Design an enzyme around this catalytic site. Structure first.
Site, PDB file in Angstrom:
ATOM      1  N   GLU A 100       3.698  19.475  62.102  1.00 59.55           N
ATOM      2  CA  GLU A 100       2.637  19.838  61.039  1.00 59.55           C
ATOM      3  C   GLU A 100       2.790  21.260  60.877  1.00 59.55           C
ATOM      4  O   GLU A 100       2.195  21.620  59.864  1.00 59.55           O
ATOM      5  CB  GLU A 100       1.307  19.623  61.832  1.00 59.55           C
ATOM      6  CG  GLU A 100       0.964  18.003  62.022  1.00 59.55           C
ATOM      7  CD  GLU A 100       1.126  17.101  60.782  1.00 59.55           C
ATOM      8  OE1 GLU A 100       0.534  17.309  60.045  1.00 59.55           O
ATOM      9  OE2 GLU A 100       1.459  15.848  60.973  1.00 59.55           O
TER      10      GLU A 100
ATOM     11  N   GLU B 273      -3.002  25.494  56.342  1.00 59.73           N
ATOM     12  CA  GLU B 273      -2.430  24.978  55.450  1.00 59.73           C
ATOM     13  C   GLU B 273      -2.081  25.975  54.166  1.00 59.73           C
ATOM     14  O   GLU B 273      -3.047  27.019  53.861  1.00 59.73           O
ATOM     15  CB  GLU B 273      -3.265  24.057  54.860  1.00 59.73           C
ATOM     16  CG  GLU B 273      -2.726  23.119  53.357  1.00 59.73           C
ATOM     17  CD  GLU B 273      -3.441  22.012  53.211  1.00 59.73           C
ATOM     18  OE1 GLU B 273      -4.491  21.534  53.996  1.00 59.73           O
ATOM     19  OE2 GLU B 273      -3.251  21.411  51.900  1.00 59.73           O
TER      20      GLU B 273
HETATM   21 MG   LIG Z   1       0.262  19.947  56.093  1.00 61.68          MG
END
Ligand SMILES: [Mg+2]
Ligand SMILES: *[C@@H]1O[C@H](CO)[C@@H](O[C@@H]2O[C@H](CO)[C@@H](O)[C@H](O)[C@H]2NC(C)=O)[C@H](O)[C@H]1NC(C)=O
Ligand SMILES: [Cl-]
Ligand SMILES: [Cl-]
Ligand SMILES: [Cl-]
Ligand SMILES: [Mg+2]
Length: 292
Positions: free
Chosen positions: A122, A141
């Site tokens: 991730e 993000e």
């Molecule tokens: Mg991501």
């Protein structure tokens, strides 16, 4: 791109002394002209040592083992450099006592390897195809885009539920449920998951430990506490690492054959299994699993 004190980076990065945009100490620290100090300048702080030898879970993953798994996360081009520490991980895990402490030592090691593989994926700063030493490079993000709000739930901050921390926790509903179970108001203060390392690790272990019907928990799958319930056999859902990919992101990644994201998750998992001296076990992909 190019930038200056009078033309900041359009996407919000640091403007270096030489007028280029980036997120490393070279762009952000000495001589920086705009939007500075967004990453740590200089050496990381010394270890707090608050976890000591790590306690019960440290018998499976020592301080040295944690830093061997996450070997390159403090490279100068990782924006999260210095954020992720062993002491915060062990403090977070103490809040979920079954995590990494369920079953025989082979199962405990494989659960921990699978958790670090999925969270390394991730947050990956590595290249497709490996190698697999640069997990945990990021904590937010990179291009927060869409509103991340399921309309069923309160949404005081419609642009603020983008991915944060090791599992890149996303969506208002996950911030509601996670915050409820860890006694934090993440719905109203979602940046706690990228400013506080203990809370950041707690959010990732929370997701890993929590069933959300119809999904079982990743924990119960990897510690041999799940058995396919009926619809599951003919959806192709078999116990193993692949089913944890389905739980995490199967709607986008599972059921349609070879996929580069899935291969990257498996690549981290095999690498960490080799470091732990264990076998990855069975059913590593979700290529013929129907998503949940
Ligand atoms: Mg991501
Ligand atoms: C990171 O978050 C944790 C938890 O919110 C903070 O530690 C807790 O702080 C409260 C008071 O604010 C104490 O009563 C608890 O005993 C603390 N420990 C826990 C809950 O395990 C911690 O201070 C935060 N760290 C930083 C650097 O802000
Ligand atoms: Cl550390
Ligand atoms: Cl086993
Ligand atoms: Cl999904
Ligand atoms: Mg980041």
């Amino acid at each position: 791109e190019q930038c200056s004190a009078i033309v900041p980076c359009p996407g919000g990065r640091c403007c270096s002394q030489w007028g280029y945009c980036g997120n490393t100490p070279a762009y952000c620290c000495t001589g920086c002209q705009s939007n500075c100090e967004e990453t740590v300048c200089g050496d990381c702080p010394p270890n707090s040592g608050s976890a000591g030898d790590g306690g019960e879970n440290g018998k499976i993953i020592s301080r040295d083992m944690f830093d061997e798994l996450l070997k390159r996360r403090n490279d100068l081009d990782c924006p999260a450099r210095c954020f992720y520490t062993y002491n915060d991980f062990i403090q977070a895990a103490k809040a979920f006592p079954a995590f990494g402490d369920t079953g025989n030592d082979v199962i405990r090691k494989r659960e921990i390897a699978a958790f670090f593989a999925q969270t390394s994926h991730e947050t990956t700063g590595g290249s497709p195809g490996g190698p697999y030493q640069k997990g945990y490079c990021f904590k937010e993000e990179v291009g927060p885009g869409g509103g991340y709000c399921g309309g069923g739930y309160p949404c005081p901050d419609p642009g603020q539920y983008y991915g944060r921390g090791p599992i890149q926790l996303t969506w208002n509903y996950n911030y509601i449920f996670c915050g409820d179970d860890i006694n934090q108001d993440l719905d109203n203060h979602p940046n706690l998951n990228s400013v506080n390392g203990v809370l950041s690790f707690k959010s990732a272990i929370w997701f890993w430990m929590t069933p959300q019907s119809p999904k079982p928990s990743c924990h119960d799958v990897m510690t041999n506490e799940w058995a396919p319930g009926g619809a599951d056999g003919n959806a192709g859902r078999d116990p193993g690492f692949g089913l944890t990919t389905n739980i995490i992101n199967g709607g986008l990644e599972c059921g349609f054959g070879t996929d580069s994201r899935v291969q990257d998750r498996i690549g981290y998992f095999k690498h960490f299994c080799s470091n732990f001296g264990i076998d990855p076990g069975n059913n590593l992909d979700c290529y013929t699993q129907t998503p949940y």
